[PDB]
Amino acid sequence: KKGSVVIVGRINLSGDTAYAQQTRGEEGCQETSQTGRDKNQVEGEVQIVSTATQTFLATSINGVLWTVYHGAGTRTIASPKGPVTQMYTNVDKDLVGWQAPQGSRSLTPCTCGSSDLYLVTRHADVIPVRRRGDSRGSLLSPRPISYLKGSAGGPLLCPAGHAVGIFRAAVSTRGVAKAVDFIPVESLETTMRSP
Amino acid sequence: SDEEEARELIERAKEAAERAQEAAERTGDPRVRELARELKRLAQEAAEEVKRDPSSSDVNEALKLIVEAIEAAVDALEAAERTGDPEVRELARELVRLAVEAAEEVQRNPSSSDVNEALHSIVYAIEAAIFALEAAERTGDPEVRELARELVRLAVEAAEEVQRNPSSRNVEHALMRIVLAIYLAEENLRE
Ligand SMILES: CC(C)(C)OC(=O)N[C@H]1CCCCC/C=C\[C@@H]2C[C@@]2(C(=O)NS(=O)(=O)C2CC2)NC(=O)[C@@H]2C[C@@H](OC(=O)n3cc4cccc(F)c4c3)CN2C1=O
Ligand SMILES: [Zn+2]
């Protein structure tokens, strides 16, 4: 009954700033979700992803495509070889991951320790974030939540374009966000093997 | 940049002080008034302690947390005011009360990591509570209300145990679990 998560677009980060593309319309999405079979070529570091009710982001880091649990649940992802099961599922971190699809490229984890972060939205906006702690960053100006909604699973990048984390939640009062919560890149826990 | 950050913190403290004052007046409750007055008091004492040490990079981070605490506590107070259920209201007020106590402890002992952690945990809890209370009011839904109650009760329980024994383990996973449940409940109502 529950379908696969479907790639409906992508965001390219290797150009000067972000560039988003739509690769699938509403109709193709629902059929692909049912079969779990998607033969489209995948490219880029950030995928735009859909369930029947929500659209959000997924970011490739260390050969894994990561997103938020609160979007994907336990769903498989549609792939050229049919539905692919999650490799990682951690509800306590709001985190899931599938093996990065053939043709995607991973972001490199940040090693520079910079506090000047940039949050990439689904529409390829780039929002500055000042890192505060492990998993929190301040916005430079208060932001209505509607500009952030649908961008969970997306990257926070350092000035060099390395991954610092995955966007998870907006710290907000009455529809106005002042800060963001992200899964730090150090928390993207992988294992050498799987049963 | 340098002393520009100290002035910025004073201005946040004064706005936090004003918002606290506005909450003290707006409410027809002596229990809220006194909490709001205490928050204003801590805001003004934070603003004054920055003015004593304006070019001091060291102690200005413990006072940054106090100003953050106050801002969040005022948000929690405003959300409590718009909450229909008196049980939830009472629980929200108790969390704000515990925040006031933890802020006073930080101000009296700014270099202690135990005292700073306790305040941080309460602020974390308050942000979760604000999401929960606001979801309860937006939806008017009984299940979202009971989840919001569970969250605030948990937050109060944790802060009171951490008062007794500083070591006492954190409820961050347990709070986020309810946030998710609230979120999914709200999403199911859209349908
Ligand atoms: C944490 C705190 C301070 C209490 O605040 C908030 O809970 N705030 C809210 C504000 C909601 C308004 C929209 C804000 C706009 C954009 C938000 C990024 C976004 C999103 O775009 N989702 S989505 O539409 O793409 C969606 C399709 C993918 N996330 C959300 O809505 C998430 C989901 C839900 O959070 C969680 O279930 N958990 C489970 C966790 C486990 C561990 C740690 C965590 F932190 C966890 C957070 C509430 N969320 C918030 O953000
Ligand atoms: Zn970096």
Side-chain angles (χ1 to χ4, degrees):
Chain A
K1 174 74 155 285
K2 271 190 208 267
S4 286
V5 165
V6 181
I7 299 174
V8 299
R10 72 174 73 97
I11 307 169
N12 258 45
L13 301 176
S14 29
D16 275 29
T17 63
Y19 182 92
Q21 296 177 292
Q22 180 171 238
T23 53
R24 204 177 274 286
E26 189 170 82
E27 179 53 29
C29 186
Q30 196 219 288
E31 292 175 294
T32 308
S33 187
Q34 277 164 1
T35 62
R37 194 201 53 252
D38 177 14
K39 292 183 182 200
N40 287 170
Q41 278 155 337
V42 173
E43 278 142 56
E45 302 94 333
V46 180
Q47 305 310 129
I48 303 176
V49 292
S50 273
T51 63
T53 55
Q54 295 173 128
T55 305
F56 51 107
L57 299 175
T59 308
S60 180
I61 301 165
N62 299 325
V64 178
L65 188 65
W66 304 100
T67 193
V68 283
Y69 180 83
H70 75 258
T74 59
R75 290 168 178 83
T76 54
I77 192 162
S79 97
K81 308 189 162 209
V84 172
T85 293
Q86 293 177 10
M87 283 178 80
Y88 307 103
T89 311
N90 188 343
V91 304
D92 291 331
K93 285 175 181 168
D94 194 18
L95 183 67
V96 313
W98 307 268
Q99 188 163 79
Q102 173 62 225
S104 75
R105 51 190 52 195
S106 274
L107 294 160
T108 307
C110 183
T111 45
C112 69
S114 175
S115 281
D116 302 328
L117 313 181
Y118 300 94
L119 187 161
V120 182
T121 73
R122 181 143 65 72
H123 302 283
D125 315 296
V126 174
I127 298 170
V129 174
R130 183 73 181 164
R131 196 180 192 161
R132 293 309 175 188
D134 191 44
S135 55
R136 294 295 188 84
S138 59
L139 298 170
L140 275 64
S141 54
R143 185 80 68 182
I145 58 167
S146 81
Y147 298 120
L148 305 172
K149 193 197 173 298
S151 297
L156 282 94
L157 311 174
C158 77
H162 307 135
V164 175
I166 298 300
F167 182 33
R168 172 161 68 189
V171 186
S172 75
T173 291
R174 300 307 301 277
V176 179
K178 248 182 71 60
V180 293
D181 189 289
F182 59 92
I183 303 145
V185 80
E186 292 81 15
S187 297
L188 308 175
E189 221 185 332
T190 59
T191 60
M192 234 48 66
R193 282 179 194 86
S194 280
Chain B
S1 190
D2 289 294
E3 316 101 301
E4 287 154 38
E5 284 197 37
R7 282 158 146 268
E8 217 160 301
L9 196 68
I10 292 154
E11 224 87 83
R12 285 218 283 155
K14 280 197 189 190
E15 275 168 50
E18 270 181 5
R19 289 181 66 229
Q21 180 57 44
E22 264 131 39
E25 296 188 71
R26 199 201 286 105
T27 58
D29 202 321
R31 287 179 293 200
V32 180
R33 201 176 321 278
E34 288 315 312
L35 286 170
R37 272 170 186 157
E38 285 292 281
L39 292 165
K40 190 179 90 161
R41 212 207 75 235
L42 287 162
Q44 289 169 345
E45 286 176 26
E48 288 302 299
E49 274 283 336
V50 176
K51 291 220 119 188
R52 275 163 187 164
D53 263 301
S55 189
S56 174
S57 196
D58 293 312
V59 208
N60 265 239
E61 298 306 325
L63 274 83
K64 206 197 178 89
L65 178 50
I66 296 155
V67 175
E68 275 176 43
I70 289 154
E71 284 172 338
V74 173
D75 290 6
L77 226 49
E78 285 165 4
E81 189 167 12
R82 302 176 311 258
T83 298
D85 191 326
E87 329 262 36
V88 181
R89 281 213 296 290
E90 184 139 73
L91 288 169
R93 283 197 306 274
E94 283 299 276
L95 195 56
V96 173
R97 197 196 107 256
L98 288 157
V100 167
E101 288 176 20
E104 287 176 315
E105 278 303 290
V106 169
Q107 206 201 341
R108 191 143 59 251
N109 198 12
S111 62
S112 178
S113 72
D114 273 8
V115 174
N116 271 275
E117 253 309 308
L119 186 58
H120 180 273
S121 279
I122 289 171
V123 170
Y124 187 98
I126 285 171
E127 296 170 337
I130 289 162
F131 171 83
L133 305 186
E134 287 178 4
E137 197 60 7
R138 189 170 53 248
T139 65
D141 186 86
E143 183 190 2
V144 178
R145 184 201 34 92
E146 278 190 11
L147 292 161
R149 191 181 62 192
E150 183 188 347
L151 190 158
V152 294
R153 184 178 283 146
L154 220 48
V156 171
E157 202 185 61
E160 287 173 339
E161 216 186 339
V162 161
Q163 264 190 8
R164 294 193 290 271
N165 316 118
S167 196
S168 303
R169 206 63 231 185
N170 82 87
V171 292
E172 294 181 29
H173 292 165
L175 295 169
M176 292 303 105
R177 186 170 312 125
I178 301 157
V179 165
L180 178 59
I182 286 164
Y183 179 81
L184 296 175
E186 174 153 21
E187 286 297 309
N188 173 70
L189 294 169
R190 246 172 187 81
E191 315 302 314

